[PDB]
Design an enzyme around this catalytic site. Structure first.
Site, short mmCIF file in Angstrom:
data_model
loop_
_atom_site.label_atom_id
_atom_site.label_comp_id
_atom_site.label_asym_id
_atom_site.label_seq_id
_atom_site.Cartn_x
_atom_site.Cartn_y
_atom_site.Cartn_z
N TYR A 17 -2.61 64.78 -112.89
CA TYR A 17 -3.33 65.05 -114.12
C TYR A 17 -3.67 63.83 -114.99
CZ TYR A 17 -3.02 69.90 -112.99
OH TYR A 17 -3.21 71.08 -112.34
N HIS A 22 -8.38 66.58 -119.94
CA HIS A 22 -7.40 67.16 -120.86
C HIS A 22 -6.30 66.14 -121.28
CE1 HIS A 22 -6.70 71.07 -122.67
NE2 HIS A 22 -5.59 71.36 -122.03
N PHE A 68 4.53 71.29 -120.62
CA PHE A 68 3.27 71.88 -120.29
C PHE A 68 2.48 71.70 -121.56
CE2 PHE A 68 5.97 74.67 -117.49
CZ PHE A 68 5.38 74.42 -116.28
N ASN A 70 0.82 73.69 -123.17
CA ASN A 70 0.93 74.76 -124.16
C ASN A 70 2.28 74.80 -124.84
OD1 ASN A 70 1.39 75.85 -121.31
ND2 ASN A 70 2.48 77.24 -122.71
N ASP A 95 -8.41 65.75 -126.36
CA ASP A 95 -9.75 66.06 -125.85
C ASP A 95 -10.46 67.06 -126.73
OD1 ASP A 95 -7.56 67.38 -124.42
OD2 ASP A 95 -9.14 68.91 -123.96
N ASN A 116 -4.80 74.60 -126.14
CA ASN A 116 -3.50 75.23 -126.10
C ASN A 116 -2.48 74.29 -126.72
OD1 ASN A 116 -3.64 76.84 -122.76
ND2 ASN A 116 -4.26 77.60 -124.82
#
Length: 194
Positions: A17, A22, A68, A70, A95, A116
């Site tokens: 990632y 993101h 995570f 969120n 972002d 999130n």
């Protein structure tokens, strides 16, 4: 004189990632830490990579959550509360869909915009929206339903230069923010378009 004690760069964890859209917020915190020669420490108590920078010559804490997305709120709240930092003294780099690649903007308050990370941040700082944000434009795809995969994707090469320029300039203006204040930092950043 200026309000920010803690800069947070929001992120999905791990190498898969690291290059996705993101994770733009973290690119800022990463560059700013490279330039000021700080290596971020893994602090499990704070659910992230943290560090402390001396920037002309203010104490700035930096944080990239390893939660995570969120649950970014856990890291930001655990670090804020431990150093006695209030929401209005936290800038969160993230972002932004509503802005194109190459553009960045500072703002206070507002919505999560379906992000999130920002949502959980609002919530874990106790339903308080009034932290600052550094909004990094990443554009948005065609349809509301494509969004999640747009953000978990890697921008193609040419969009990625527009992004890397806004990261670069956001850092510079964060240095300005610490020398001249928010107003001047903001004027300069909001005339930039790569």
């Amino acid at each position: 004189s200026q309000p920010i004690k803690l800069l947070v760069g929001l992120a999905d964890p791990g190498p898969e990632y690291a290059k996705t859209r993101h994770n733009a917020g973290a690119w800022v915190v990463e560059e700013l830490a490279r330039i000021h020669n700080v290596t971020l420490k893994n602090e499990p108590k704070f659910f992230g990579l943290t560090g402390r920078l001396l920037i002309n010559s203010q104490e700035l804490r930096v944080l990239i959550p390893t939660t995570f997305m969120n649950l970014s709120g856990k890291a930001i709240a655990a670090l804020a509360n431990f150093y006695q930092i209030k929401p209005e003294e936290i800038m969160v780099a993230h972002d932004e869909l509503d802005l194109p690649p190459g553009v960045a903007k500072f703002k206070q308050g507002g919505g999560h915009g379906g992000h999130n990370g920002l949502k959980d941040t609002i919530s874990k700082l106790g339903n308080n929206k009034e932290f600052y944000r550094l909004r990094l434009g990443i554009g948005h795809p065609g349809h509301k339903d494509k969004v999640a995969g747009y953000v978990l994707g890697k921008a193609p090469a040419k969009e990625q230069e527009c992004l890397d320029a806004a990261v670069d300039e956001s850092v510079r203006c964060l240095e300005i923010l610490m020398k001249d204040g928010l107003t001047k930092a903001q004027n300069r950043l909001h005339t930039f378009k790569a």
